[PDB]
């Protein structure tokens, strides 16, 4: 059929778009007119990739199919982040292969089994009561300030405390853990231009290796002991593997949940009836509708290891496919009224945590718990909050971020 009605050279990974808005109409145009579409990229404008473009994947069933066929659609070959600075050196993409998100089977399989021996429902539930306390204190301190930046005073801290609690980081070390975690989220936005994620990653690995050595001597009620203790087959994270796991957790556990919280509250501010309902019933289905609405990871990619036909389109060996979770999470064929914010939506088969498959978010239930606990505290302590001014968005080609959002907590 006809080509989609998009500006010439439009690139769905263009960070300049996301600094200002989400390209919702443009994704909807692809879903209607070209649901798998070649996103050409001019020379040097590939965000670190120099292959002329990628396939934009906009439908939820195609996202699931790619996520399920990890034997064809590789994470390792080019990593899963689809956009860096245009001049990033290839070696700096490939160094990301040392974290489990960017590996393939069998290396991925071994690492995930280890990381899931201690990253369990029991381990996550053991954090509930401390995170609930922490959420209530966060919302109370914010309410006591009267007004301020919702991102920094409400959204930022609880995800970081969840990472610290899961790893057993002593309170005296949490400040520098949080600092490293914030540094690692990138430097593509002018506000963050001076951050050095490479150096912070190196500092975190050093910290984590020391922790691994200490905790081997003195086991404790954290997941760490389960990770570095050999099983029957002698399987365990090496000290440097634990280091790369901590890097993985420090980055993955921070900005995505933060941005869920900020955008969830933005949604409630635009849909006051859903906010009234939330405050009365406190439904935990809210968390998934908030992750669907927020889609904190706009997109992750894969690389085809062989020719593969996907929904009538021929994907060729070596081509990238980019899974636009932001489009799939609003797919009219899967969701009833996707552009309605409905905190009781159930079932809610969103792909905010990725498609079912080998790389499905191991932190999904921790994130959901974090979200439910912070929104209960917000409802308890600042039920009448109202925004002062517009959110400031983050310049990124794949993360959907809110840097700042001024709010009057007393309303
Ligand atoms: C709302 C919050 C979050 C969102 C939107 C989110 C999103 C995602 C997505 C889309 C993936 C799929 C990776 C792929 O298929 O290439 C993923 C994987 C992953 N997430 Fe999350 N995530 C969240 C929170 C967390 C938290 C809190 C943690 C850890 C405490 C975490 C750790 C991980 C890890 C380690 C993986 C990689 C798993 C593997 O490669 O086997 N995430 N996440
Ligand atoms: C899964 C994954 C993530 C996730 C993974 C990586 C992530 C972030 C945020 C930043 N990075 C890394 C940034 N890249 C490019 C810029 N240079 C440094 C390296 C989140 C979250 C949840 N679940």
Author numbering: 17 to 427
Authors' account:
The replacement of the cyclohexyl group with a piperazine ring, 14, showed a significant drop in affinity. In the X‐ray co‐crystal structures of compounds 14 and 15 in complex with CYP125, the pyridine coordinates directly with the heme iron, but in an orientation that is rotated almost exactly 180° around the heme vertical axis relative to compound 4.
